[PDB]
C-alpha cells in the first residue's frame, strides 16, 4: 500500500524502454528538419526524454499521468505514419505492447494503495 512506490517503478520501466532498440525513434522529440510537416498533423509532441524529465522534476502526481503521456507517444506515431507497415510505426506497436505489459501492475498497485489510504 505504498502510495509513492510508482515513481521508482516508472523510472525502472523508462530505463528498460531506453535499452530497447524499438525506442530509438521515440527517445527525443521528433526532428522537424527530418519531418517538416510533423506539426501540421501532431498537436502535442511527446517523447521518452520529456516523460523522464517530467517524472524527475516531480511534475507527475500519479502513474496515470505518466501513462497518458507515454500513450501519446504511440498515438502520435500512429497518426503520423503513412502506412500501418512503416518501420517506425511497427517499432511503436512492439514498444507499446512491452509498456502496457509492464505498466499494468504499477497502475493497479497505485490505485489499490490510494483506495487503502482513503478507506
Ligand X SMILES: O=C(NC1CC1)c1ccc2c(c1)OCO2
Copy the grid coordinates of residue 15: 530505463
Minimum separation from the CB atom of position 31 to ligand X (A): 7
Under the criterion CB under 6 A, does residue 26 sit at the interface with ligand X? yes
Residues 6+ apart with CB under 8 A from 118: none
Helices and strands (DSSP H and E) totals, the chain: 5, 0
Our CB check for ligand X shows the closer of 22 and 109 to be 22
Burial class (CB in 10 A: 0-12, 13-18, 19+), 38: middle
Shortest CB 36 distance to ligand X, Å:
12
Q: Which of residues 34-93 bind ligand X (CB under 6 A)?
A: 77, 80-82, 86, 88-89
- Residue ranges in contact with ligand X by CB under 6 A: 25-26, 30, 77, 80-82, 86, 88-89
Amino acid at each position: 500500500y505504498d502510495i509513492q512506490a510508482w515513481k521508482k517503478q516508472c523510472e525502472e520501466l523508462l530505463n528498460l524502454i531506453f535499452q530497447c532498440e524499438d525506442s530509438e525513434p521515440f527517445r527525443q522529440p521528433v526532428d522537424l528538419l527530418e519531418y517538416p510537416d510533423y506539426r501540421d498533423i501532431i498537436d502535442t509532441p511527446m517523447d521518452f526524454a520529456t516523460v523522464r524529465e517530467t517524472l524527475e522534476a516531480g511534475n507527475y502526481e500519479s502513474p496515470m499521468e505518466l501513462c497518458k503521456d507515454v500513450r501519446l507517444i504511440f498515438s502520435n506515431s500512429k497518426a503520423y505514419t503513412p502506412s500501418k507497415r512503416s518501420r517506425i510505426y511497427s517499432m511503436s506497436l512492439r514498444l507499446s505492447a512491452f509498456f502496457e505489459e509492464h505498466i499494468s501492475s504499477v497502475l493497479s498497485d497505485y490505485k489499490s494503495a490510494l483506495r487503502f489510504h482513503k478507506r
